[PDB]
């Protein structure tokens, strides 16, 4: 068992789906948390798009990187869409990755599904390495 932590720009989307897939598919293999370098609120279409696959993220909302502990998360992931490099301990992990996906907020549910499938596949490929 190792820990994974997701960063997004305002923690509204991507990162929250990454916790959604990892908490389901990595259940008992890993432990997971979602955050961002800024905070807003969870995007309500994100929950609807995880409910298409029977996964619940409604108990999550946005939380800031500044309250969290990068030193304990064995892995840290960035999902910001460029403009972000995490200069502190947020890149001194056992593994760090950056998943530069599309931005579904104000797009269409096919664009949310297009992002969701990529967030899922990066998580399934990661948890099998760090279990």
């Amino acid at each position: 068992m190792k820990k994974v932590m997701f960063v997004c720009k305002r923690n509204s989307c991507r990162s929250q789906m990454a916790e959604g897939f990892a908490k389901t598919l990595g259940a008992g293999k890993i432990a997971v948390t979602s955050c961002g370098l800024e905070s807003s609120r969870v995007h309500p279409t994100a929950i609807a798009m995880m409910e298409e696959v029977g996964i619940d993220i409604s108990g999550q909302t946005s939380d800031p990187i500044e309250n969290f502990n990068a030193d304990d998360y064995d892995v840290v992931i960035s999902l910001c869409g460029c403009g972000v490099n995490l200069p502190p301990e947020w890149v001194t992990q056992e593994i760090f990755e950056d998943w530069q996906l599309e931005d579904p907020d104000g797009q269409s549910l096919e664009v949310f599904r297009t992002v969701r499938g990529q967030v899922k596949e990066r998580v399934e490929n990661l948890i099998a390495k760090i279990s």
Side-chain angles (χ1 to χ4, degrees):
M1 180 175 283
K2 292 180 176 175
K3 301 88 63 206
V4 190
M5 169 59 117
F6 310 100
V7 151
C8 179
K9 203 182 69 174
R10 73 284 228 275
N11 195 214
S12 49
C13 196
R14 294 190 297 267
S15 55
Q16 303 284 14
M17 296 183 169
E19 200 201 290
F21 286 116
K23 75 201 293 167
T24 308
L25 304 178
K29 287 155 66 68
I30 60 58
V32 270
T33 312
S34 187
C35 74
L37 57 149
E38 303 187 84
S39 190
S40 61
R41 71 298 300 189
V42 139
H43 200 281
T45 310
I47 294 138
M49 296 275 96
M50 296 307 305
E51 281 277 76
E52 296 201 315
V53 297
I55 294 179
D56 178 35
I57 63 164
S58 194
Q60 296 153 234
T61 192
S62 295
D63 284 290
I65 202 175
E66 300 188 275
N67 106 109
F68 287 125
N69 47 247
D71 184 70
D72 187 61
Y73 315 135
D74 303 277
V75 183
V76 167
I77 311 297
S78 185
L79 309 90
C80 301
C82 303
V84 181
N85 301 102
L86 304 188
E89 57 174 72
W90 291 91
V91 296
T92 67
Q93 282 70 35
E94 179 173 89
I95 310 180
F96 172 93
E97 299 185 33
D98 73 294
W99 307 342
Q100 309 301 355
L101 305 185
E102 297 68 34
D103 200 75
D105 182 1
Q107 308 287 10
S108 303
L109 278 56
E110 185 175 85
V111 177
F112 274 93
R113 288 163 59 97
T114 295
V115 169
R116 187 191 69 208
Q118 295 171 97
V119 180
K120 186 184 187 192
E121 92 180 280
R122 296 306 303 171
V123 161
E124 296 187 276
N125 122 103
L126 172 59
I127 62 194
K129 297 175 187 291
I130 61 69
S131 285

